């Protein structure tokens, strides 16, 4: 199984993408063993980026690595189509889209039509990003089968039965979980890995959990998994999408600038208090030699 | 109380705003007794619109009426701020924003700061659009009080207890419902009216329900409310946001063009089945002398 | 419209029904204008009573008043049937049942069969008690129509659209709300009243809200309604089912003994603090002359 | 890890416990490799049983095996206390209770006191049965830690993160899942097993899945898990609790009598359609040599 980082988009003080900070972040991720980078995902504030900014992010990351899944979705199908076609000139793993968000009570026929349109135009394999809490819709294993063109799915949901059903109904589909708390479990139960937002700031931890689980050291994997779980809880105190910036600077030693408001940056006191919550976890990760200080 | 139309955005075949069809629609709604027009709402596919397109919608409706609430929100606060400021040169009722959508687990502090920022820059009264199913967040009466700068709220939620609580904690706030099935109830329980998506296609019905309720003819207001409920139920079969285009053409006699995919238009057969579902209702309404012909 | 009290079941220190305290409570309720008493409902800890205790409660209340709706439901259909038949010798308003609780994923056919069986044996009109949160199932207006034998329904749900749909599909059915916060709204919108748990301790308030609303004094009704809303919030601090005992003693001047554990009685400090929360509301109700001290 | 059967309660035509059919069933389950029997659970219609009937179920299964967890909970704490104490004279694995059901908005303090009371009186280890959908309350890992006296937990919930959290906060607690679709996953991620309702009718399947998973043959455990998933899906068509009677007769060859209404038995046609839905699965299982014949 794989660990895929939904990579953070660093912004400047003037609310532009800070490409050089992004390249440094992507470079470190790959060096630490991340298999692939999911660009323009939730953690990257994809929904807050213009089409032109989504392309900007692809080009920056591609200067570091071609192991990219390129998220192109949005509420303007013409823009999503254009981004899909633009990717033909890149040697990337695939494109991806979440379901059309905001609008509830969308018909299944229209949801299927949206994804089938993206498949019809894609020059690359297509990954379903299923995130029912964020988008308001579930593209479950039956619907994914009906759509019929997905190479893989990322299932972000509080229900691993739902995730397993993709393998059950689509046995040749790649199936990933979006739950950082399930890295050990996903690996142990025959699924294909995790798209882990916490791998932005603790890539060492996420790959080691998975490796321990694949070495049949489940107890050791769960011990490390439970420590990762505690860092995730701390990031939720002040909002995980904002806190991800602070935690990456803290654990990896370079800064990712700013989020894009309304994803507001933590102030200096929130940062202080967040670091207080994870300081001891860092110390234990250093002792275990997962972190080189 | 008032009926406010979240006005549909007509699109061209090549996915541009059809300003001419939009003026025709706005003129009819005002002519038929609609009090104000809510622009770039859900029914107008506001989240599908770029900032420039949101302002293009304002300019077109502004050629018809000053009775406009201008929705400006989105996931780029700089863009929403820019639209709020640009509205100074329009003599309109107010601006409005739904909560930041898509992202779950946003802190209350960040949500409050988002709305307060818009208030600080607004040259007009500010209206909260609360729509928890669509945005994933609830800005309830307590948080609205905390934010402290709203002139009104539109509460799109089936729980009218929630809606009444805005009046109980903010007695000077205008309080509207977004649930078309509650026009008679809202008007009769002391609230300030409905932003009614079905007033796009049956403004005569929505206005007459409000009138009967104001006269305390509640039994007669319910009979018409219950017929209106049946048209909403029919609109959902193929998807409400797409079906509203078809229903406005059927009942009001003019074309509103296309929606913006992934809000796909109904096909000719879907149109036929929908008309068949409501043509009896139209007869019942002609008989009742609410609709001509 | 009517105010119906789901009457509290007082228990002794030895976990038996205190019949004499119940008779005093029922007597006061009727004297203060409550139209009818719903016996063995949620507020009466019906689900915690044996069949024999449910009958006990009927006989005690019937010594005071025949205006009784007798709740008989449970997970042993044979017992529910026996209680239904036993009521033939009483001149009561009707029997009632909530849907079979605990078990999820019950088929609609089995739910319909359960209620139709109770109708087949009832010597009195039958009321549907719909409480989806408590039972896990919704017996909505379509299902109630399918069942076809309900004289009335009590809808306890956070959604007045749902409640109105019973009138829309069953125009000759009595339709009540179980939301104490909606007394004014229910009366104003053409529904038949409220089964109000707060009428146990403030029957004066509940009947006056309804009366003001029917006198077309909606503002005055809402003012009193919002004060009742504040008492309900206070009862939730420590658990409303337990707090109902303390609040009835406080406002009505007689005690109702104890609840049945696990509905634990508040201790003396919780009681102190609860009274602190409503002390000022009592003072304002005295000033308004709704309460005679 | 272990497979534990929440054993079905067979009823007679006249609605009494059929002790003879219950012993036959318990004997077969032990014979086929089931580790322990959970008595008066959901699958056994425990909430439909009186206290005397819960004890009658214990005595009957106790004639067969000592490997019993005895569920004793209910809405009369005196009755649950009495059953806990009566269990002293049985050499069994432990007692158990689901949370107080039906009543919403029970305070955490009252829920904690309920479980602590049972612990104080118990002559055996105490197991928490957590089933939020059925009871309306969640007793999560933190509250279980607060209660502090549980030897194990059965977590009936699709979110395995929730289940894992019991191990993370209570490392010495036995942690079981109640989701049959997760037997392979649970066994492979370091948890202590499943209380599997489908082990009533396919104990051979449930035991073999656990075995394959323990051998780290996860792919082969998933294939059998996915066939087991199909039988559960078929059981839901007409209602799982009723259908389990029919499925145990089909697969294990002996009659388990009737359920207790409103858990109504399937009718002869419903039985035929269910068998038709699973007879292919039976062939696939015979072919795989998991079932004889």
PDB file of C-alpha atoms in Angstrom, chain A residues 68-293:
ATOM      1  CA  UNK A  68       0.990  13.661  -9.226  1.00  0.00           C
ATOM      2  CA  UNK A  69      -2.738  13.089  -9.035  1.00  0.00           C
ATOM      3  CA  UNK A  70      -4.188  16.338 -10.414  1.00  0.00           C
ATOM      4  CA  UNK A  71      -7.540  17.422  -8.929  1.00  0.00           C
ATOM      5  CA  UNK A  72      -9.509  19.478 -11.476  1.00  0.00           C
ATOM      6  CA  UNK A  73     -13.111  19.495 -10.270  1.00  0.00           C
ATOM      7  CA  UNK A  74     -15.433  22.423  -9.712  1.00  0.00           C
ATOM      8  CA  UNK A  75     -18.863  23.852 -10.376  1.00  0.00           C
ATOM      9  CA  UNK A  76     -17.945  25.052 -13.882  1.00  0.00           C
ATOM     10  CA  UNK A  77     -17.695  21.882 -15.956  1.00  0.00           C
ATOM     11  CA  UNK A  78     -16.101  23.818 -18.846  1.00  0.00           C
ATOM     12  CA  UNK A  79     -13.163  24.782 -16.613  1.00  0.00           C
ATOM     13  CA  UNK A  80     -12.770  21.250 -15.239  1.00  0.00           C
ATOM     14  CA  UNK A  81     -12.744  19.904 -18.813  1.00  0.00           C
ATOM     15  CA  UNK A  82     -10.100  22.440 -19.861  1.00  0.00           C
ATOM     16  CA  UNK A  83      -7.846  21.497 -16.925  1.00  0.00           C
ATOM     17  CA  UNK A  84      -8.303  17.796 -17.756  1.00  0.00           C
ATOM     18  CA  UNK A  85      -7.162  18.336 -21.354  1.00  0.00           C
ATOM     19  CA  UNK A  86      -4.251  20.602 -20.354  1.00  0.00           C
ATOM     20  CA  UNK A  87      -2.820  17.687 -18.382  1.00  0.00           C
ATOM     21  CA  UNK A  88      -2.172  15.738 -21.614  1.00  0.00           C
ATOM     22  CA  UNK A  89       1.300  17.328 -21.786  1.00  0.00           C
ATOM     23  CA  UNK A  90       2.272  16.074 -18.313  1.00  0.00           C
ATOM     24  CA  UNK A  91       3.480  12.611 -17.313  1.00  0.00           C
ATOM     25  CA  UNK A  92       1.312  12.345 -14.203  1.00  0.00           C
ATOM     26  CA  UNK A  93      -0.370   9.508 -12.355  1.00  0.00           C
ATOM     27  CA  UNK A  94      -3.897  10.748 -13.025  1.00  0.00           C
ATOM     28  CA  UNK A  95      -6.493  13.451 -12.679  1.00  0.00           C
ATOM     29  CA  UNK A  96      -9.138  13.479  -9.944  1.00  0.00           C
ATOM     30  CA  UNK A  97     -12.342  15.252  -9.010  1.00  0.00           C
ATOM     31  CA  UNK A  98     -14.593  15.476  -6.009  1.00  0.00           C
ATOM     32  CA  UNK A  99     -18.326  15.374  -6.631  1.00  0.00           C
ATOM     33  CA  UNK A 100     -20.096  18.672  -7.418  1.00  0.00           C
ATOM     34  CA  UNK A 101     -20.394  20.406  -4.065  1.00  0.00           C
ATOM     35  CA  UNK A 102     -22.775  22.866  -2.359  1.00  0.00           C
ATOM     36  CA  UNK A 103     -25.962  21.913  -4.186  1.00  0.00           C
ATOM     37  CA  UNK A 104     -27.981  19.195  -2.399  1.00  0.00           C
ATOM     38  CA  UNK A 105     -30.565  16.882  -3.943  1.00  0.00           C
ATOM     39  CA  UNK A 106     -28.553  16.474  -7.150  1.00  0.00           C
ATOM     40  CA  UNK A 107     -29.863  13.595  -9.246  1.00  0.00           C
ATOM     41  CA  UNK A 108     -27.746  10.485  -9.583  1.00  0.00           C
ATOM     42  CA  UNK A 109     -28.034  10.854 -13.367  1.00  0.00           C
ATOM     43  CA  UNK A 110     -26.419  14.286 -13.235  1.00  0.00           C
ATOM     44  CA  UNK A 111     -23.690  13.145 -10.853  1.00  0.00           C
ATOM     45  CA  UNK A 112     -22.874  10.173 -13.111  1.00  0.00           C
ATOM     46  CA  UNK A 113     -22.952  12.483 -16.139  1.00  0.00           C
ATOM     47  CA  UNK A 114     -20.474  14.897 -14.509  1.00  0.00           C
ATOM     48  CA  UNK A 115     -17.875  12.174 -13.903  1.00  0.00           C
ATOM     49  CA  UNK A 116     -18.437  10.410 -17.231  1.00  0.00           C
ATOM     50  CA  UNK A 117     -17.823  13.718 -18.995  1.00  0.00           C
ATOM     51  CA  UNK A 118     -14.458  14.075 -17.235  1.00  0.00           C
ATOM     52  CA  UNK A 119     -13.536  10.519 -18.196  1.00  0.00           C
ATOM     53  CA  UNK A 120     -14.473  11.159 -21.839  1.00  0.00           C
ATOM     54  CA  UNK A 121     -11.955  14.009 -22.050  1.00  0.00           C
ATOM     55  CA  UNK A 122      -9.196  12.784 -19.776  1.00  0.00           C
ATOM     56  CA  UNK A 123      -5.760  11.946 -21.252  1.00  0.00           C
ATOM     57  CA  UNK A 124      -4.899  10.185 -17.982  1.00  0.00           C
ATOM     58  CA  UNK A 125      -6.468   7.728 -15.545  1.00  0.00           C
ATOM     59  CA  UNK A 126      -9.265   9.227 -13.442  1.00  0.00           C
ATOM     60  CA  UNK A 127      -9.606   8.979  -9.651  1.00  0.00           C
ATOM     61  CA  UNK A 128     -12.858   9.437  -7.750  1.00  0.00           C
ATOM     62  CA  UNK A 129     -12.492  11.670  -4.677  1.00  0.00           C
ATOM     63  CA  UNK A 130     -15.441  10.743  -2.475  1.00  0.00           C
ATOM     64  CA  UNK A 131     -15.964  13.147   0.427  1.00  0.00           C
ATOM     65  CA  UNK A 132     -19.645  13.142   1.463  1.00  0.00           C
ATOM     66  CA  UNK A 133     -19.281  15.509   4.425  1.00  0.00           C
ATOM     67  CA  UNK A 134     -17.600  18.174   2.286  1.00  0.00           C
ATOM     68  CA  UNK A 135     -19.601  17.847  -0.942  1.00  0.00           C
ATOM     69  CA  UNK A 136     -23.012  16.750   0.345  1.00  0.00           C
ATOM     70  CA  UNK A 137     -23.137  13.662  -1.903  1.00  0.00           C
ATOM     71  CA  UNK A 138     -21.912  10.073  -1.703  1.00  0.00           C
ATOM     72  CA  UNK A 139     -20.519   8.435  -4.830  1.00  0.00           C
ATOM     73  CA  UNK A 140     -20.572   4.937  -3.332  1.00  0.00           C
ATOM     74  CA  UNK A 141     -19.274   1.690  -4.792  1.00  0.00           C
ATOM     75  CA  UNK A 142     -22.435   1.014  -6.809  1.00  0.00           C
ATOM     76  CA  UNK A 143     -22.369   4.478  -8.389  1.00  0.00           C
ATOM     77  CA  UNK A 144     -18.635   4.264  -8.999  1.00  0.00           C
ATOM     78  CA  UNK A 145     -19.290   0.973 -10.803  1.00  0.00           C
ATOM     79  CA  UNK A 146     -22.101   2.559 -12.836  1.00  0.00           C
ATOM     80  CA  UNK A 147     -19.722   5.357 -13.838  1.00  0.00           C
ATOM     81  CA  UNK A 148     -17.302   2.615 -14.850  1.00  0.00           C
ATOM     82  CA  UNK A 149     -14.178   4.605 -15.712  1.00  0.00           C
ATOM     83  CA  UNK A 150     -12.378   5.126 -12.385  1.00  0.00           C
ATOM     84  CA  UNK A 151      -8.876   3.766 -12.013  1.00  0.00           C
ATOM     85  CA  UNK A 152      -9.036   4.481  -8.272  1.00  0.00           C
ATOM     86  CA  UNK A 153     -11.039   6.055  -5.464  1.00  0.00           C
ATOM     87  CA  UNK A 154     -10.156   8.014  -2.338  1.00  0.00           C
ATOM     88  CA  UNK A 155     -12.939   7.497   0.217  1.00  0.00           C
ATOM     89  CA  UNK A 156     -12.983  10.149   2.959  1.00  0.00           C
ATOM     90  CA  UNK A 157     -15.708   8.919   5.278  1.00  0.00           C
ATOM     91  CA  UNK A 158     -16.195   7.639   8.842  1.00  0.00           C
ATOM     92  CA  UNK A 159     -17.039   4.106   7.723  1.00  0.00           C
ATOM     93  CA  UNK A 160     -14.544   1.535   6.482  1.00  0.00           C
ATOM     94  CA  UNK A 161     -17.350  -0.805   5.380  1.00  0.00           C
ATOM     95  CA  UNK A 162     -18.161   1.812   2.754  1.00  0.00           C
ATOM     96  CA  UNK A 163     -14.522   1.879   1.653  1.00  0.00           C
ATOM     97  CA  UNK A 164     -14.224  -1.918   1.420  1.00  0.00           C
ATOM     98  CA  UNK A 165     -17.353  -2.056  -0.738  1.00  0.00           C
ATOM     99  CA  UNK A 166     -15.378  -0.403  -3.572  1.00  0.00           C
ATOM    100  CA  UNK A 167     -13.041  -3.432  -3.682  1.00  0.00           C
ATOM    101  CA  UNK A 168     -16.002  -5.789  -3.367  1.00  0.00           C
ATOM    102  CA  UNK A 169     -17.824  -4.277  -6.356  1.00  0.00           C
ATOM    103  CA  UNK A 170     -14.764  -3.072  -8.328  1.00  0.00           C
ATOM    104  CA  UNK A 171     -12.048  -5.675  -7.585  1.00  0.00           C
ATOM    105  CA  UNK A 172      -9.545  -4.113 -10.026  1.00  0.00           C
ATOM    106  CA  UNK A 173      -9.941  -0.566  -8.637  1.00  0.00           C
ATOM    107  CA  UNK A 174      -7.334   1.108  -6.461  1.00  0.00           C
ATOM    108  CA  UNK A 175      -9.017   1.940  -3.156  1.00  0.00           C
ATOM    109  CA  UNK A 176      -7.597   4.438  -0.686  1.00  0.00           C
ATOM    110  CA  UNK A 177      -8.820   5.853   2.604  1.00  0.00           C
ATOM    111  CA  UNK A 178      -8.717   9.514   3.518  1.00  0.00           C
ATOM    112  CA  UNK A 179      -8.598   8.765   7.274  1.00  0.00           C
ATOM    113  CA  UNK A 180      -5.135   9.351   8.737  1.00  0.00           C
ATOM    114  CA  UNK A 181      -6.325   7.414  11.810  1.00  0.00           C
ATOM    115  CA  UNK A 182      -6.751   4.266   9.671  1.00  0.00           C
ATOM    116  CA  UNK A 183      -3.265   3.935   8.088  1.00  0.00           C
ATOM    117  CA  UNK A 184      -2.439   0.800  10.052  1.00  0.00           C
ATOM    118  CA  UNK A 185      -5.902  -0.704   9.572  1.00  0.00           C
ATOM    119  CA  UNK A 186      -6.085   0.014   5.831  1.00  0.00           C
ATOM    120  CA  UNK A 187      -2.713  -1.630   5.236  1.00  0.00           C
ATOM    121  CA  UNK A 188      -3.592  -4.627   7.405  1.00  0.00           C
ATOM    122  CA  UNK A 189      -6.934  -5.287   5.673  1.00  0.00           C
ATOM    123  CA  UNK A 190      -5.905  -5.422   2.011  1.00  0.00           C
ATOM    124  CA  UNK A 191      -6.688  -1.905   0.814  1.00  0.00           C
ATOM    125  CA  UNK A 192      -4.273   0.169  -1.230  1.00  0.00           C
ATOM    126  CA  UNK A 193      -3.209   2.892   1.178  1.00  0.00           C
ATOM    127  CA  UNK A 194      -4.100   6.310   2.539  1.00  0.00           C
ATOM    128  CA  UNK A 195      -4.370   9.833   1.248  1.00  0.00           C
ATOM    129  CA  UNK A 196      -3.149  11.247   4.573  1.00  0.00           C
ATOM    130  CA  UNK A 197      -3.319  14.974   5.272  1.00  0.00           C
ATOM    131  CA  UNK A 198      -1.044  14.480   8.298  1.00  0.00           C
ATOM    132  CA  UNK A 199       1.713  13.232   6.006  1.00  0.00           C
ATOM    133  CA  UNK A 200       2.288  16.904   5.187  1.00  0.00           C
ATOM    134  CA  UNK A 201       3.870  17.413   8.613  1.00  0.00           C
ATOM    135  CA  UNK A 202       4.784  13.867   9.737  1.00  0.00           C
ATOM    136  CA  UNK A 203       5.561  11.944   6.531  1.00  0.00           C
ATOM    137  CA  UNK A 204       8.045   9.832   8.522  1.00  0.00           C
ATOM    138  CA  UNK A 205       5.275   8.698  10.842  1.00  0.00           C
ATOM    139  CA  UNK A 206       2.764   7.859   8.136  1.00  0.00           C
ATOM    140  CA  UNK A 207       5.126   5.723   6.055  1.00  0.00           C
ATOM    141  CA  UNK A 208       6.442   3.948   9.155  1.00  0.00           C
ATOM    142  CA  UNK A 209       2.945   3.042  10.389  1.00  0.00           C
ATOM    143  CA  UNK A 210       2.201   1.444   7.024  1.00  0.00           C
ATOM    144  CA  UNK A 211       5.592  -0.290   6.868  1.00  0.00           C
ATOM    145  CA  UNK A 212       5.224  -1.751  10.369  1.00  0.00           C
ATOM    146  CA  UNK A 213       1.751  -3.013   9.478  1.00  0.00           C
ATOM    147  CA  UNK A 214       3.064  -4.643   6.303  1.00  0.00           C
ATOM    148  CA  UNK A 215       5.907  -6.223   8.305  1.00  0.00           C
ATOM    149  CA  UNK A 216       3.205  -7.930  10.424  1.00  0.00           C
ATOM    150  CA  UNK A 217       4.076  -5.808  13.469  1.00  0.00           C
ATOM    151  CA  UNK A 218       0.515  -4.663  14.079  1.00  0.00           C
ATOM    152  CA  UNK A 219       1.016  -3.808  17.763  1.00  0.00           C
ATOM    153  CA  UNK A 220       3.998  -1.596  16.895  1.00  0.00           C
ATOM    154  CA  UNK A 221       2.031  -0.042  14.033  1.00  0.00           C
ATOM    155  CA  UNK A 222      -0.926   0.715  16.313  1.00  0.00           C
ATOM    156  CA  UNK A 223       1.373   2.290  18.923  1.00  0.00           C
ATOM    157  CA  UNK A 224       2.720   4.690  16.299  1.00  0.00           C
ATOM    158  CA  UNK A 225      -0.779   5.088  14.838  1.00  0.00           C
ATOM    159  CA  UNK A 226      -2.179   6.183  18.208  1.00  0.00           C
ATOM    160  CA  UNK A 227       0.532   8.842  18.484  1.00  0.00           C
ATOM    161  CA  UNK A 228      -0.354  10.161  15.031  1.00  0.00           C
ATOM    162  CA  UNK A 229      -3.992  10.164  16.179  1.00  0.00           C
ATOM    163  CA  UNK A 230      -3.036  12.517  19.039  1.00  0.00           C
ATOM    164  CA  UNK A 231      -1.374  14.991  16.667  1.00  0.00           C
ATOM    165  CA  UNK A 232      -4.501  15.022  14.498  1.00  0.00           C
ATOM    166  CA  UNK A 233      -6.680  15.799  17.515  1.00  0.00           C
ATOM    167  CA  UNK A 234      -4.398  18.717  18.396  1.00  0.00           C
ATOM    168  CA  UNK A 235      -4.682  20.135  14.872  1.00  0.00           C
ATOM    169  CA  UNK A 236      -8.474  20.190  15.241  1.00  0.00           C
ATOM    170  CA  UNK A 237      -8.367  22.496  18.286  1.00  0.00           C
ATOM    171  CA  UNK A 238      -7.962  25.632  16.164  1.00  0.00           C
ATOM    172  CA  UNK A 239      -9.002  24.171  12.793  1.00  0.00           C
ATOM    173  CA  UNK A 240      -6.956  21.469  11.093  1.00  0.00           C
ATOM    174  CA  UNK A 241      -6.657  23.161   7.668  1.00  0.00           C
ATOM    175  CA  UNK A 242      -5.069  26.239   9.270  1.00  0.00           C
ATOM    176  CA  UNK A 243      -3.119  24.241  11.868  1.00  0.00           C
ATOM    177  CA  UNK A 244      -1.543  22.103   9.133  1.00  0.00           C
ATOM    178  CA  UNK A 245       0.670  25.078   8.218  1.00  0.00           C
ATOM    179  CA  UNK A 246       1.913  25.517  11.803  1.00  0.00           C
ATOM    180  CA  UNK A 247       2.506  21.785  12.272  1.00  0.00           C
ATOM    181  CA  UNK A 248       4.539  21.441   9.066  1.00  0.00           C
ATOM    182  CA  UNK A 249       6.809  24.329  10.036  1.00  0.00           C
ATOM    183  CA  UNK A 250       7.189  22.838  13.510  1.00  0.00           C
ATOM    184  CA  UNK A 251       7.947  19.260  12.452  1.00  0.00           C
ATOM    185  CA  UNK A 252       9.678  19.795   9.090  1.00  0.00           C
ATOM    186  CA  UNK A 253      11.518  23.057   9.698  1.00  0.00           C
ATOM    187  CA  UNK A 254      10.412  25.150   6.721  1.00  0.00           C
ATOM    188  CA  UNK A 255       7.371  27.411   6.590  1.00  0.00           C
ATOM    189  CA  UNK A 256       4.439  27.211   4.163  1.00  0.00           C
ATOM    190  CA  UNK A 257       3.443  30.865   4.345  1.00  0.00           C
ATOM    191  CA  UNK A 258      -0.273  31.442   4.817  1.00  0.00           C
ATOM    192  CA  UNK A 259      -3.588  29.739   4.076  1.00  0.00           C
ATOM    193  CA  UNK A 260      -6.226  31.521   2.015  1.00  0.00           C
ATOM    194  CA  UNK A 261      -8.927  33.283   4.127  1.00  0.00           C
ATOM    195  CA  UNK A 262     -11.555  32.301   5.211  1.00  0.00           C
ATOM    196  CA  UNK A 263      -9.047  29.584   6.070  1.00  0.00           C
ATOM    197  CA  UNK A 264      -7.424  32.048   8.452  1.00  0.00           C
ATOM    198  CA  UNK A 265      -3.871  31.637   9.764  1.00  0.00           C
ATOM    199  CA  UNK A 266      -3.517  30.835  13.435  1.00  0.00           C
ATOM    200  CA  UNK A 267      -2.235  33.797  15.406  1.00  0.00           C
ATOM    201  CA  UNK A 268       0.951  33.639  17.467  1.00  0.00           C
ATOM    202  CA  UNK A 269      -0.819  32.524  20.651  1.00  0.00           C
ATOM    203  CA  UNK A 270      -2.736  29.721  18.921  1.00  0.00           C
ATOM    204  CA  UNK A 271       0.554  28.570  17.390  1.00  0.00           C
ATOM    205  CA  UNK A 272       2.201  28.643  20.826  1.00  0.00           C
ATOM    206  CA  UNK A 273      -0.618  26.575  22.327  1.00  0.00           C
ATOM    207  CA  UNK A 274      -0.750  24.120  19.430  1.00  0.00           C
ATOM    208  CA  UNK A 275       2.988  23.440  19.740  1.00  0.00           C
ATOM    209  CA  UNK A 276       2.435  22.924  23.472  1.00  0.00           C
ATOM    210  CA  UNK A 277      -0.013  20.131  22.624  1.00  0.00           C
ATOM    211  CA  UNK A 278       2.405  18.268  20.319  1.00  0.00           C
ATOM    212  CA  UNK A 279       5.762  19.111  21.951  1.00  0.00           C
ATOM    213  CA  UNK A 280       5.741  15.886  23.961  1.00  0.00           C
ATOM    214  CA  UNK A 281       4.763  13.806  20.945  1.00  0.00           C
ATOM    215  CA  UNK A 282       7.772  15.176  19.049  1.00  0.00           C
ATOM    216  CA  UNK A 283      10.006  14.210  21.981  1.00  0.00           C
ATOM    217  CA  UNK A 284       8.662  10.642  21.923  1.00  0.00           C
ATOM    218  CA  UNK A 285       9.086  10.440  18.135  1.00  0.00           C
ATOM    219  CA  UNK A 286      12.698  11.593  18.512  1.00  0.00           C
ATOM    220  CA  UNK A 287      13.288   8.966  21.208  1.00  0.00           C
ATOM    221  CA  UNK A 288      11.828   6.268  18.945  1.00  0.00           C
ATOM    222  CA  UNK A 289      14.163   7.645  16.219  1.00  0.00           C
ATOM    223  CA  UNK A 290      11.279   8.202  13.798  1.00  0.00           C
ATOM    224  CA  UNK A 291      12.254  11.883  13.755  1.00  0.00           C
ATOM    225  CA  UNK A 292      15.905  12.925  13.400  1.00  0.00           C
ATOM    226  CA  UNK A 293      15.360  15.741  15.888  1.00  0.00           C
TER     227      UNK A 293
END
